Amino acid sequence: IVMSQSPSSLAVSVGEKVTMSCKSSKNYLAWYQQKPGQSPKLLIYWASTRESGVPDRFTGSGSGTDFTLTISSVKAEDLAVYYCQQYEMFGGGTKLEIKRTVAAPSVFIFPPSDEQLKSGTASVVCLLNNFYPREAKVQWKVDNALQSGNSQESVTEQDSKDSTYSLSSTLTLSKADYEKHKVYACEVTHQGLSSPVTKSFNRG
Amino acid sequence: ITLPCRPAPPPHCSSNITGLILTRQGGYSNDNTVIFRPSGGDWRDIARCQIAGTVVSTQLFLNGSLAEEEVVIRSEDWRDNAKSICVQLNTSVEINCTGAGHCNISRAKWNNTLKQIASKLREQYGNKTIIFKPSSGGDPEFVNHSFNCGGEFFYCDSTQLFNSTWF
Amino acid sequence: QVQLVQSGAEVKKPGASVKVSCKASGYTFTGYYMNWVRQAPGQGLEWMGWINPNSGGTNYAQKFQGRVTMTRDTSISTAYMELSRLRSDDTAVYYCARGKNSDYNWDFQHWGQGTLVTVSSASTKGPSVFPLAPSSKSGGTAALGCLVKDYFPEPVTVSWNSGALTSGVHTFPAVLQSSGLYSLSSVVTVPSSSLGTQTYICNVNHKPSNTKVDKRVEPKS
Ligand SMILES: *[C@@H]1O[C@H](CO)[C@@H](O)[C@H](O)[C@H]1NC(C)=O
Ligand SMILES: [N+]
């Protein structure tokens, strides 16, 4: 009596019409919406019965082992994962991504704090803020020399309001290794940047 | 089968067994096994069976009203494991308490009635192996088979009746 | 005004036991069956078991039998889910759920906030907070933040001005260092003008280590 939910990923533009399927194996089906960082919310509580306060664009349908959820006029807030439940089984998948116009990243560079330098480590941070699409490359140069193995990056979840990702790459060195060079540079590559941005600094 | 009981049930309390009430084992183990346990619901689950008898009892029914011909099993929803499954038996398995601690029933006839119920469940669910296991826990009223006889409640450890496999 | 409040996240060693609580308020606790759902980390929802708040009878999932026990305390209306033989692959977010109508279960209208239980042989470590201070940026808008480094395990919650500054806040997922420790950053964009007029504070919380920290992000000199 297992169930599957498709499609897994699903990117669309605001206002576009979305329709996702849930294949089981007036029935008692439910649809939950889990927005980034929150617990599930019961959108539909009987195949096609919307919950109180659920806007009208969400509609459920289905009778046999197959069911369907649909959003008529998608909005940026509708970014979330969607689960279909029958009794004690959840479907999983169906992450609703959002399409958007290209947005070049805003590059910023943060040197380490004297506190961290007293600790022993020295972490430089490079922040690519509010860009789109996700694809973006970050390189770290010390005295104009490519680095490797000493950096870790993380991309945020697609923001709910402006639907734009944000990336941060931290380059961690030792206080000694840090004080043996002057320039520290972050080079960024993105679609909305013909030439790679290069925001750098020097301990002068 | 010896069924120990906390308050020594007197000889007067030796009712016939005229049905039962079970609950499904949730989850999804692809292994062809359907586990059933003694009911876990509240008194509402037992009252929904409508097998009102002269004896108020948990776990298995006593001195109720038996079945017309064969076993009849009616559940408010089979796919739903939260709603319990009632059972009426064709012939009763007399349960006689010795008067002291233990309360004994048939050693083998219970296995026969268990196989009968297991086939009646096979036909409803998948024609696969069926297993009877004891309660998953609860309060002493429903964890231990309780029966209200002559103004006194008697609790008995029904762990001896649910340890069966049927292929 | 219904409310289901679960316990805080914590860490246990493989094989230990963890008892998660669920305080319920706003309805008759003894009326609605209480279920416990575990969300594996990014791997969908799987239901664990349900308990009846009157009889105390339980129905667990065939995947958790012999490893879980659900109990209740109706005097204070608190459900409990205890998990023993704790495997290291059972690190997930544990929620308690109810349902809209008292008759039917499985239509979970209410959910708890969650409870991230972690299971590892590694020991708990408190985060180190540092200020990513404002510098030459843009736009006429500055960007500040704080780096929370060398901590284990997840989660670490970072707010700003005690939840008053949120528009423009970007808190990044955790990055796993080669040393098995986590590190993240929480930033926010503000106007360059109000740098000297307003004060901005990172509020970091790491319950596993019972750590509450407040760090003021100030311009450099
Ligand atoms: C029937 O139930 C009553 C009380 O519940 C009990 O006195 C009686 O022993 C039971 N049946 C027989 C044959 O004793
Ligand atoms: N109930």
Side-chain angles (χ1 to χ4, degrees), chain A residues 3 5-8 10-20 22 24-25 27-34 36-40 42 44-53 55-60 62 64-147 149-174 176-194 196-204, chain B residues 1 4-5 7-11 13-14 16 18-19 21 23-27 30 32-34 36-43 47 49-55 58-61 63-67 72 75 77-84 86-89 92-93 97 99-103 105-110 113 115-116 118-126 128 130-132 134-142 145-147 149-156 158 160-162 164-167, chain C residues 1-4 6-18 20-27 29-61 64-101 104-122 124-127 129-157 159-174 176-184 187-216 218-219:
Chain A
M3 305 186 58
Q5 192 188 233
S6 291
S8 60
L10 185 58
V12 292
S13 188
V14 178
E16 189 171 332
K17 183 170 176 291
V18 169
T19 287
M20 62 200 62
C22 174
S24 181
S25 310
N27 308 14
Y28 279 108
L29 184 73
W31 293 87
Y32 301 88
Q33 176 215 45
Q34 188 181 9
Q38 309 178 10
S39 54
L42 186 71
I44 308 297
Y45 70 94
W46 188 354
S48 66
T49 314
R50 78 178 48 126
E51 183 66 29
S52 81
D56 293 297
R57 53 172 176 285
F58 302 68
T59 71
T65 187
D66 296 318
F67 301 91
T68 302
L69 178 65
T70 70
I71 297 88
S72 65
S73 176
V74 173
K75 298 186 179 181
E77 274 60 13
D78 293 349
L79 196 180
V81 176
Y82 295 85
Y83 299 91
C84 58
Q85 181 202 21
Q86 192 169 358
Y87 292 129
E88 77 249 28
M89 305 291 185
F90 299 102
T94 314
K95 188 191 205 78
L96 183 54
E97 299 179 345
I98 303 302
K99 247 178 287 184
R100 189 202 187 284
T101 314
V102 177
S106 302
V107 185
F108 307 117
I109 186 163
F110 305 78
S113 62
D114 298 2
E115 186 178 354
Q116 193 190 171
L117 293 176
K118 281 173 58 55
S119 178
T121 54
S123 302
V124 186
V125 178
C126 190
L127 174 52
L128 296 56
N129 208 8
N130 303 334
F131 62 81
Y132 186 100
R134 171 182 305 96
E135 298 84 42
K137 303 83 178 177
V138 176
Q139 307 192 70
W140 280 102
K141 301 201 180 199
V142 181
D143 278 20
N144 188 2
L146 279 164
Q147 297 292 320
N150 49 15
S151 65
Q152 299 183 127
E153 59 174 71
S154 296
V155 188
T156 60
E157 176 55 33
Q158 194 172 18
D159 191 74
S160 61
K161 311 193 190 67
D162 54 1
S163 299
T164 188
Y165 306 87
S166 308
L167 180 154
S168 65
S169 81
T170 313
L171 167 144
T172 308
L173 296 171
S174 176
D177 310 0
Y178 178 76
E179 287 193 343
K180 290 195 177 189
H181 308 89
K182 59 177 190 175
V183 178
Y184 293 75
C186 174
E187 185 176 61
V188 174
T189 313
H190 190 252
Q191 300 183 9
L193 289 166
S194 65
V197 176
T198 308
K199 197 149 276 176
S200 67
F201 80 94
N202 41 26
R203 306 183 304 107
Chain B
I1 298 298
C5 309
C13 312
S14 285
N16 289 59
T18 69
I21 182 176
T23 40
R24 268 186 45 72
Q25 185 68 188
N30 214 157
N32 299 19
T33 67
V34 187
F36 295 89
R37 295 178 181 274
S39 183
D42 54 328
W43 285 103
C49 293
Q50 297 179 347
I51 307 180
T54 67
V55 62
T58 72
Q59 212 78 186
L60 51 93
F61 266 99
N63 291 348
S65 319
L66 309 205
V72 58
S75 177
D77 192 323
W78 299 97
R79 302 176 190 85
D80 184 0
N81 61 34
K83 307 298 96 176
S84 298
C86 314
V87 176
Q88 274 195 17
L89 299 179
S92 64
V93 179
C97 305
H102 286 173
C103 189
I105 65 179
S106 56
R107 314 316 197 94
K109 168 171 199 192
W110 188 249
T113 43
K115 180 183 175 182
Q116 294 176 16
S119 183
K120 287 290 296 191
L121 295 172
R122 274 186 181 90
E123 59 168 272
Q124 194 71 13
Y125 295 137
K128 51 176 66 177
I130 285 183
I131 299 173
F132 295 94
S135 193
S136 183
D139 282 2
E141 301 88 53
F142 314 93
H145 170 39
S146 55
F147 60 93
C149 172
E152 183 181 3
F153 276 87
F154 303 89
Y155 311 151
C156 304
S158 62
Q160 302 294 314
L161 301 176
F162 314 87
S164 309
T165 302
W166 311 112
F167 280 74
Chain C
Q1 298 176 359
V2 184
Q3 204 92 5
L4 301 181
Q6 308 179 233
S7 308
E10 55 183 358
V11 196
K12 300 294 177 182
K13 311 306 181 187
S17 293
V18 53
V20 182
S21 311
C22 180
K23 176 90 194 315
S25 64
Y27 70 90
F29 178 85
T30 62
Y32 298 71
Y33 285 50
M34 186 71 71
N35 301 33
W36 283 91
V37 181
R38 113 179 182 184
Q39 179 181 21
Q43 338 184 3
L45 306 171
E46 54 181 338
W47 170 79
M48 310 187 70
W50 64 253
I51 187 177
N52 167 251
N54 296 283
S55 152
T58 72
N59 190 344
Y60 305 143
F64 295 114
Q65 274 294 351
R67 200 179 85 110
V68 66
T69 70
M70 296 182 186
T71 56
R72 82 199 175 288
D73 190 322
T74 54
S75 56
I76 58 177
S77 299
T78 295
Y80 297 95
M81 181 283 301
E82 185 176 355
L83 191 63
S84 61
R85 282 175 26 79
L86 213 59
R87 306 197 201 96
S88 179
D89 69 75
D90 294 321
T91 77
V93 184
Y94 297 83
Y95 300 95
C96 49
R98 183 192 90 130
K100 189 184 189 319
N101 300 337
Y104 182 48
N105 195 239
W106 313 106
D107 284 341
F108 306 145
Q109 198 279 348
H110 305 89
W111 293 71
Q113 72 278 17
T115 298
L116 173 52
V117 184
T118 311
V119 188
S120 80
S121 64
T124 309
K125 178 176 180 60
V129 183
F130 304 102
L132 301 177
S135 174
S136 311
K137 299 167 178 7
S138 173
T141 65
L144 57 145
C146 58
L147 176 70
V148 172
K149 194 174 184 296
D150 293 331
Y151 77 87
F152 180 94
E154 222 156 9
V156 162
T157 69
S159 67
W160 286 86
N161 293 347
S162 308
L165 174 52
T166 48
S167 293
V169 165
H170 282 345
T171 300
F172 298 85
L176 177 273
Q177 301 179 23
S178 186
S179 58
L181 294 175
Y182 291 118
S183 59
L184 69 82
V187 301
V188 68
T189 65
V190 305
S192 308
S193 58
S194 69
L195 289 177
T197 76
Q198 258 74 83
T199 59
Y200 306 91
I201 297 174
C202 272
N203 316 120
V204 179
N205 275 22
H206 190 233
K207 200 275 162 190
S209 65
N210 287 332
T211 293
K212 293 187 176 185
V213 184
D214 296 83
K215 191 69 70 179
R216 177 181 177 180
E218 185 182 357

